[PDB]
């Protein structure tokens, strides 16, 4: 239940990563200022699919597809992961 | 070789030896090169 790190894999120019690119361009700064001590790794994918990774205690990690999501849906998913949901 | 002796050289054997196979003088092959990889020697003193 203890969140250790967040990984966001967005492709640079794929159509399906437009929402993730918009989120990172707009609200990533406020998201990082809300969690100053949380690793939020921004990495680039090849054209397969966008994904989000959350790593919990003792090496357990979960992944969720962010494909075709908008900025609002990405924000919803991130605030769900950062809180006691799912 | 009496009328035509061979050429004398300082490195030529002065005593001919026959086939020494089957005897304690037999040739035993071995690698003639040095050890290639040198291992690290740990210190001989305690560390605390």
């Amino acid at each position: 239940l203890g969140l250790r790190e967040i990984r966001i894999h967005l492709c640079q120019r794929s159509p399906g990563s437009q929402g993730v690119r918009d989120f990172i361009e707009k609200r990533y700064v406020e998201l990082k200022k809300a969690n100053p001590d949380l690793p939020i790794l921004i990495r680039e994918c090849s054209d397969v699919q966008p994904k989000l990774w959350a790593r919990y205690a003792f090496g357990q990690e979960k992944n969720v597809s962010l494909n075709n999501f908008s900025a609002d849906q990405v924000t919803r998913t991130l605030e769900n992961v950062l809180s006691g949901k799912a | 070789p009496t009328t035509k002796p061979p050429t004398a050289r300082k490195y030529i054997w002065t005593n001919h030896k026959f086939n020494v196979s089957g005897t304690p003088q037999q040739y035993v092959p071995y690698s003639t090169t040095r050890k290639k990889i040198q291992e690290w020697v740990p210190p001989s003193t305690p560390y605390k």
């Binding site: - | 490195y11 304690p24 003088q25 040739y27 035993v28 071995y30 690698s31 003639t32 090169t33 040095r34």
Partner: protein, 96 residues
């Protein structure tokens, strides 16, 4: 210039002798270790340096076509002698 190791094994011209704790020594038990006694480095070290009166000397190893390819050796440096890259003979210009 043969030399014996602290174990008694004759050290060859290439400098290889088994370590006292090396099991491969057992191949020489009841037998011998073949070692050539004419060390070439010592033999070539005994040859005198030839005095020649030219800046460039030619060496073919002696014997004409029975030697090595003929090379030409520069002898301008008085600090060191001119050595043949094939035979090891040494040449120098008159000094002193």
């Amino acid at each position: 210039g043969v030399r014996t190791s602290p174990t008694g094994e004759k050290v060859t011209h290439t400098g290889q002798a088994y370590d006292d704790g090396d099991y491969r020594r057992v191949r020489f038990s009841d037998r011998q270790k073949e070692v050539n006694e004419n060390f070439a480095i010592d033999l070539i070290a005994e040859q005198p340096v030839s005095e020649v009166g030219s800046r460039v000397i030619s060496c073919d190893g002696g014997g004409g076509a029975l030697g090595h390819p003929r090379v030409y050796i520069n002898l301008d440096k008085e600090t060191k002698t001119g050595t043949c890259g094939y035979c090891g003979l040494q040449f120098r210009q008159p000094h002193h």
